[PDB]
Design a protein around this nucleic acid. Structure first.
Lengths: 94, 823
DNA sequence: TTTTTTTTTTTTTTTTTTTTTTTTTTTTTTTT
DNA sequence: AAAAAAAAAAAAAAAAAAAAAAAAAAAAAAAA
């Protein structure tokens, strides 16, 4: 119930603060090929066919604008202390 | 052969030998210039473009992370750059625009862009990525183009910004940002709105890294850049300090509204990751201060030290960076009469940092003895408040900086202690003294007395003097016998910061009891807003010092948090949480006390109230802090806490979400019995959650507001992750024989026959294979899981993507049970 | 005619989240 | 109308991929 445990939490769950989603865990080729061939180009110049190469409509826009939320910090120092007296640490894990 | 093949073997040789180690690019670009010159002097220009496209299209299947294609795309980039610099030197002094190297360049780029944009629709990722790269690297040196070609390019790139893979979107935002020379005016031919749409909307955290730097950064687009200081990715948060703010440099003090300039450095110096903090520290420490020529005073005049209270961190990032300015700044005799706000803040920071590191040299010389600083303090206090340029806000700041300089000063001179005690006693007796100076004056009067008893009797003396000053003017001004409202406010604000710093029981400190029976108990029973608020706060700071007072007034705290307004419920909830947190559980469940079930119902009524956001936030943080301190052992309240984490009505309290994001994992990880409690609650949590998601998914409203709740697969994953006995923080060894995760899985398979939806069963059954499987478990906790998986696999009809995971768990359980009964 | 920066380019570290694997089911395509 | 058909979506799960910061190094331009 001392500095080692608090620092261990403060270093492992320090990337586990965003909330509901985004909780986090674990706390050759070398080709030289430039010589001729006739009809290779159609293997790389073709239309989309059945391969859909663009984005889904449901994720082209996002409403949170991929912002991090406002960081109410909630580290172990804010947990170990009181609210009306910020200079007293309580009987932690007692 | 003919020239159609001589050009082919030439370009083949140069693009083959230039594929390695960048060797001889000044010879490569040279011989490529000779063969393009001889080709256009011959006249096979479309054939030259065709073999160019041929030997380029022999590269386009090579992906990203391949150096051999990169050393050719940069070769042709160097080629078009060579033609561009030849035209730039041709328009100048000697008029080298001969042999039509403008027309050859224009037709060359008009044919080659038309070739590469034919390949932009191919289904392979590599050819699209290399086409948009081969445009984007050379788009800066392309220059002028045709309006039809510009329209085709902007249509292709405005479709490719919404391409499915991110690596081609990187080259898309590069080739977009090379088209930036316009006047900015906005509320699809403009690139800037497209880049802003990608800097907010794009799911890749890498496209923003190349849409964040390469933008124009004028007056209009700048918040769209700077709010990327709160980007999802860590590298973007560090890179806004690394390459955007460092790039502007001196213009950041005059081109950013100070509400954002006092927000960016707070977002930097209070981040959660070390590299972005170090980048903001090195930005406030190295680039800016060596950019305005070393003047610490000129930097502090632009870091607005009067309003923003963030600078007490940022100046520390100077003092831990280069100590030559720490040792260079000297405070002579002719500056204590003519302080400014910046140099008073500088003295504050340098003295408290010098006592933080205990450098005895700068404590010895270069700083005045305590009586001299007492003279300066009394000078500024009398020049502000004993009055009958020197604005009130600046004088208040100068007195507060020198009071923080005084609160940790050298006790060793008795003349200095005597002088500063007279100055603080003559300052805190002022009626019109402002509130932060009240706080820091009470702090100095604590930190310069001999003990806590002298500070108690001095503060009680000052507060009773300010009360007697009002009772005399109430007695005299007729020409009944109670103080006014404003003097009760001024007495309670001093009593708050006084009892903030007392750390002893109150049996031998009887002046606090006299203050309470005179003022605080007639402040709680009042009917004003602010008097009742400070009365409850002062009653709580008294209740953190004695237990009989807490057991007395917990009832009126509960009634005033159950039937009162917003701020009183705030302060009373903080006091209830803090009384529990200090005093343990002698506050409930006894004779004369409050019944704790009534307090749990009060906690319920606060916790289910969406209309009070911050009261719910402090209720959540409080109940989690009290669960960690093990004074709360109730079960249904923990069930309601985890539901309130996962409810959709509490999905707008961001602070409650972060409170439950931190303080529920530190519950179950810190102790095994806490994880056992989580595993006992998680069954009915998942049941009520699946019911709520079914009734939210089949609801018929034109604006339903769904998806606040997570999909229950991720809920089941995080329930497993909290209830996993690997991640316990203890050094146990026995934790490989705990059956809590399998008990949670057995309870989930029990409740699995209590849902109606056909997707819920799929995302419950497809995730049961993440459990702890090591054959060090008990016989029965494998036996019941084997029986329930048998009954669910046989008796109920399941689809194949669920029966895969279910019979895979059957195979793993059968292998482990064979290992169990082979011994 | 070799020297003295230039420079950029080119191999070690990190932890990031990011891509890739695999199973099955859906959803628009081909023929008479 | 109608009998087959295969890329995509969804998701669990795994490991290595890899942009970036920072140190050596070979081609290159001014120089006395």
């Amino acid at each position: 119930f001392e500095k080692d445990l608090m620092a261990y939490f403060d270093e492992n769950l320090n990337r586990n603060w965003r909330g509901r989603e985004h909780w986090k865990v674990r706390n050759v080729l070398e080709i030289d090929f430039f010589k001729t061939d006739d009809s290779f180009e159609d293997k790389v110049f073709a239309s989309k066919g059945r391969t859909k190469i663009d984005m889904p409509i449901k994720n082209r826009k996002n409403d949170t604008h991929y912002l991090l939320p406002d960081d109410f910090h909630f580290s172990t120092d804010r947990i170990t202390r009181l609210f009306i007296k910020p200079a007293q640490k309580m009987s932690l894990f007692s | 052969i003919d020239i159609n093949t001589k050009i082919f073997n030439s370009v083949a040789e140069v693009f083959q030998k230039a594929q390695g180690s960048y060797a001889g690019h000044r010879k490569h670009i040279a011989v490529l210039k000779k063969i393009q010159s001889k080709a256009v002097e011959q006249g096979y220009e479309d054939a030259f473009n065709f073999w160019f496209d041929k030997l380029v299209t022999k590269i386009l299947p090579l992906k990203k992370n391949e150096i051999i294609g990169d050393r050719i795309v940069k070769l042709v980039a160097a080629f078009i750059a060579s033609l561009e610099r030849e035209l730039i030197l041709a328009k100048k002094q000697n008029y080298k625009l001969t042999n039509d190297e403008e027309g050859i360049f224009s037709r060359f780029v008009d044919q080659f862009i038309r070739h590469v944009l034919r390949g932009v629709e191919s289904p392979d990722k590599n050819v699209r990525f290399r086409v948009l790269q081969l445009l984007a690297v050379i788009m800066d040196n392309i220059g002028e183009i045709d309006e039809s070609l510009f329209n085709l390019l902007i249509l292709s790139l405005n479709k490719r910004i919404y391409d499915r893979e991110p690596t081609v979107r990187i080259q898309a935002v590069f080739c977009l940002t090379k088209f930036q020379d316009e006047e900015q005016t906005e509320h699809n031919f403009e690139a800037t709105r497209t880049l802003v749409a990608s800097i907010q909307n794009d799911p890749s955290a890498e496209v923003r890294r190349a849409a964040m730097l390469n933008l124009i950064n004028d007056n209009n687009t700048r918040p769209y850049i700077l709010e990327r200081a709160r980007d999802v990715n860590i590298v973007n948060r560090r890179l806004v300090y690394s390459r955007i703010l460092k790039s502007m440099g001196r213009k950041c003090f005059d081109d950013i509204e100070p509400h954002i300039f006092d927000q960016l450095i707070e977002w930097g110096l209070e981040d959660r990751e070390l590299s972005v903090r170090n980048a903001c520290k090195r930005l406030i420490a190295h680039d800016w201060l060596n950019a305005l020529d070393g003047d610490l005073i000129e930097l502090l005049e632009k870091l607005d030290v009067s309003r923003s209270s963030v600078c007490v961190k940022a100046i520390e990032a100077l003092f831990q960076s280069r100590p030559d300015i720490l040792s260079k700044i000297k405070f002579p005799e002719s500056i204590w009469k003519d302080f400014t706000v910046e140099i008073a803040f500088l003295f504050r920071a340098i003295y408290l940092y010098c006592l933080d590191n205990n450098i005895t040299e700068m404590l010895e010389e270069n700083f005045p003895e305590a009586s001299k600083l007492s003279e300066h303090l009394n000078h500024y206090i009398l020049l502000r408040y004993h009055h009958n340029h020197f604005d009130y806000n600046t004088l208040e700041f100068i007195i507060e900086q020198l009071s923080i300089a005084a609160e940790r000063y050298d006790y060793s001179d008795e003349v200095g202690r005597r002088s500063m005690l007279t100055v603080v006693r003559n300052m805190l007796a002022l009626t019109t003294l402002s509130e932060p100076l009240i706080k820091i004056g009470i702090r100095v009067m604590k930190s310069l007395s001999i003990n806590e008893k002298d500070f108690v009797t001095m503060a009680i003396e000052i507060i009773n003097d300010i009360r007697d000053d009002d009772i005399e003017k109430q007695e005299q001004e007729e020409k009944e016998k109670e103080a006014s409202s404003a003097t009760i406010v001024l007495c309670l604000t001093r009593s708050s910061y006084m009892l903030e710093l007392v750390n002893t029981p109150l049996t031998e400190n009887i002046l606090i009891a006299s203050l309470m029976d005179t003022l605080i108990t007639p402040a709680v029973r009042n009917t004003a807003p602010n008097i009742r608020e400070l009365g409850v706060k002062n009653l709580g700071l008294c209740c953190l010092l004695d237990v009989k007072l807490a057991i007395d007034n917990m009832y009126i705290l509960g009634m005033c948090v159950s039937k009162g307004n917003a701020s009183l419920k705030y302060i009373a909830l903080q006091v209830i949480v803090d009384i529990f947190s200090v005093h343990g559980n002698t506050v409930v469940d006894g004779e004369g006390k409050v019944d704790s079930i009534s307090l749990h119902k009060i906690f319920y009524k606060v916790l289910k109230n969406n209309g009070l956001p911050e009261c719910q936030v402090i209720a959540a943080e409080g109940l989690c802090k009290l669960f960690l301190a093990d004074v709360f052992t109730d079960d249904d309240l923990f069930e309601t806490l985890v539901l309130s984490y996962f409810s959709p009505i509490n999905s707008s309290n961001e602070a409650l979400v972060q409170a439950f994001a931190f303080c529920i994992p530190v519950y179950c990880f810190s102790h095994p019995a806490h994880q056992q409690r989580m595993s006992r609650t998680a069954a009915d949590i998942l049941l009520r959650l699946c019911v709520l998601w079914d009734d939210l998914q089949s609801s018929v409203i034109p604006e339903v507001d769904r998806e606040a709740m997570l999909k229950p697969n991720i809920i089941f994953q995080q329930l497993l992750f909290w209830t996993d006995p690997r991640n316990l923080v203890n050094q146990t060894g026995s934790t490989k024989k705990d059956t809590v995760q399998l008990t949670f899985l057995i309870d989930v398979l029990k409740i699995y026959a209590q849902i109606e939806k056909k997707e819920i069963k799929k995302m419950i059954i497809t995730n049961i294979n993440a459990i702890f499987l090591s054959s060090e478990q008990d016989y029965s906790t494998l036996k019941e899981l084997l029986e329930y998986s048998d009954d669910i696999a046989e008796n109920d009809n399941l689809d194949n993507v669920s029966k895969n995971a279910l019979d895979k768990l059957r195979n793993n359980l059968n292998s482990l049970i064979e290992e169990i009964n082979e011994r």
